[PDB]
Design a binder for these strands. Structure first.
Ligand SMILES: O=c1ccn([C@@H]2O[C@H](COP(=O)(O)OP(=O)(O)OP(=O)(O)O)[C@@H](O)[C@H]2O)c(=O)[nH]1
Ligand SMILES: [Mg+2]
Ligand SMILES: [Mg+2]
Length: 476
RNA sequence: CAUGGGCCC
RNA sequence: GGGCCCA
């Protein structure tokens, strides 16, 4: 992203709330190199010299500009994908009624009833509870006012910045690498779902290598479907982006919308518009009013869908900018936002692709830094998608999401107040794939003070998930 | 603590 | 109507 006119005003929205993640009985047992990212400008852990209001906005290195040469290529790559995509999802992308946009549709969860209302909804001390009724499916006064405004391309707004209170690595938390969230007005999210909600709903229920999207999947069951796929390709790459969602160049974003959400595909005219209102965003941090021209807001509806689409276009635009005669079937991939997994028989050289992604403002890097460079010969059982690996379950011979033990430990070391028991159960369905032994150790610190489900009770549950008949015919 | 999926209720 | 994980 690129800043242009940083300034100050009056109102000072505070979000540096004291961390709400308290150590658990397991913490002192695992001593994870992780901890809640410093949310205060003057946090003890912070290094003597590093600033908060500084590092946080140090993700905007500018907005890479493109040439008429590159633009044309990206647009074509975005057109080819758009064609390939809609040739599956169909052309049924008509707008959704104010009702549908709320209560959601088949393949699209409803809107959050108790979340950040946005702005000025925040300064007016009024939350969604005093703006829209998520039960009958209708908006209130303030909201509808915007609808008639957004339906006329005259809706201005500002994004509210938040300091995500999460568990990050000490090295990152120490350097003050606290991730920030960009909250947009609730009406903006409501209209977005109206313009391209039918799309996302179809995008979700069709996740896979084909449309190259993993949005709307469940690792516990789809890992078997994804595994087999990338299991039959000469090479597999575990690419890594640096501030992916914050480096999308204005050119790429616009051209992407102009080619993917065309009315030609059954989309409502105001589909392209409502999406572009994300390029030049006006973030608001306390008394500051930073203006950015580029990147994607860390809180806009269908944020993952956009990233996934772009991520899909970049891989094409990249490979095509190096070779000639590259097609969407020249390689296979899938992604959920920035995290991506590519594969192909051709010994593609991603190393020589780095410069090409740079034209778009992205910086690709291998997830296996141990090699310091993109090498070949790697299979799917070597990469990691969504903090999950791809291991062959000795039991049912299926593929199962296996998170790193160190990652799980850090997860079982922190939690909100009076939410332990809950997390313990949720996370339990994640460690089951770490084998019986690990599942026991990981939950050892909570034995005698909480209810820990048996490794088997969760295992069977999983089997009946990956394949209901797998556990059924297991009796015959 | 937003966006979205998924899971746990 | 909560919580959790990934993004
Ligand atoms: O609060 C949040 C949570 C998630 N996200 C978004 O979700 C995605 C998850 O991505 P990452 O945030 O995982 O990569 P990183 O910055 O840790 O990169 P390096 O330090 O290693 O270079 C990012 O690409 C980010 O845009 C936010 O912007 N804010
Ligand atoms: Mg990354
Ligand atoms: Mg990865």
């Amino acid at each position: 992203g690129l800043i242009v006119d940083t300034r100050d005003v009056e109102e000072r929205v505070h979000v540096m709330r004291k961390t709400k993640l308290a150590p658990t009985v397991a913490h002192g047992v695992f001593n994870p190199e992780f901890g809640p990212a410093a949310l205060s400008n003057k946090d003890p852990r912070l290094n003597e010299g590093v600033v908060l209001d500084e590092v946080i906005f140090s993700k905007h290195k500018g907005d890479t500009k493109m040439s008429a040469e590159d633009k044309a290529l990206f647009r074509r790559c975005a057109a080819d994908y758009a064609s390939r995509l809609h040739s599956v999802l169909g052309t049924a992308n008509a707008p959704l009624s104010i009702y549908e946009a709320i209560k959601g549709v088949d393949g699209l969860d409803a809107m959050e009833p108790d979340t950040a209302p946005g702005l000025p909804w925040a300064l007016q001390g009024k939350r969604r509870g005093a703006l829209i009724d998520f039960e009958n499916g209708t908006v209130g006064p303030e909201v509808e006012a915007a609808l008639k405004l957004m339906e006329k391309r005259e809706y201005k707004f500002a994004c509210q910045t938040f300091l995500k209170d999460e568990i990050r690595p000490m090295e990152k938390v120490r350097a003050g690498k606290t991730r920030i969230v960009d909250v947009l007005p609730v009406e903006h999210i409501l209209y977005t779902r109206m313009m391209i909600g039918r799309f996302c709903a179809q995008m979700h229920s069709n996740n896979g290598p084909q449309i190259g999207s993993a949005v709307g999947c469940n690792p516990d069951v789809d890992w078997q479907r994804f595994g087999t796929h990338f299991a039959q390709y000469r090479n597999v790459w575990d690419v890594d982006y640096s501030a992916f969602d914050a480096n999308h160049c204005s050119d790429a974003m616009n051209i992407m919308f102009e080619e993917v959400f065309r009315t030609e595909f059954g989309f409502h005219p105001n589909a392209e518009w409502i999406l572009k209102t994300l390029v030049n965003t006006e973030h608001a941090y306390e008394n500051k009013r930073i203006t950015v021209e580029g990147g994607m807001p860390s809180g806009c509806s269908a944020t993952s869908i956009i990233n996934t689409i772009l991520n899909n276009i970049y891989v094409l635009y990249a490979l095509r900018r190096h070779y000639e005669g590259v097609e969407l079937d020249t390689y296979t991939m899938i992604s959920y936002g920035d995290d991506i997994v590519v594969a192909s028989d051709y010994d593609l050289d991603f190393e020589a692709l780095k410069p090409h992604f740079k034209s778009l403002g992205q910086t690709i890097t291998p997830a296996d830094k141990s090699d310091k460079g993109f090498v070949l010969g790697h299979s799917i059982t070597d990469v990691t998608f969504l903090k999950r690996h791809f291991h062959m379950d000795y039991g049912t011979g299926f593929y199962k999401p296996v998170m790193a033990s160190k990652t799980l430990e850090a997860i079982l070391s922190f939690a909100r107040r009076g939410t332990i028991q809950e997390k313990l159960i949720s996370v339990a369905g994640l460690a089951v794939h770490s084998g019986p032994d690990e599942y026991r150790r990981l939950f050892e610190p909570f034995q005698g003070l909480f209810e820990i489900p048996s490794y088997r009770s969760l295992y069977l549950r999983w089997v009946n998930a990956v394949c209901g008949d797998a556990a059924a015919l297991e009796h015959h």
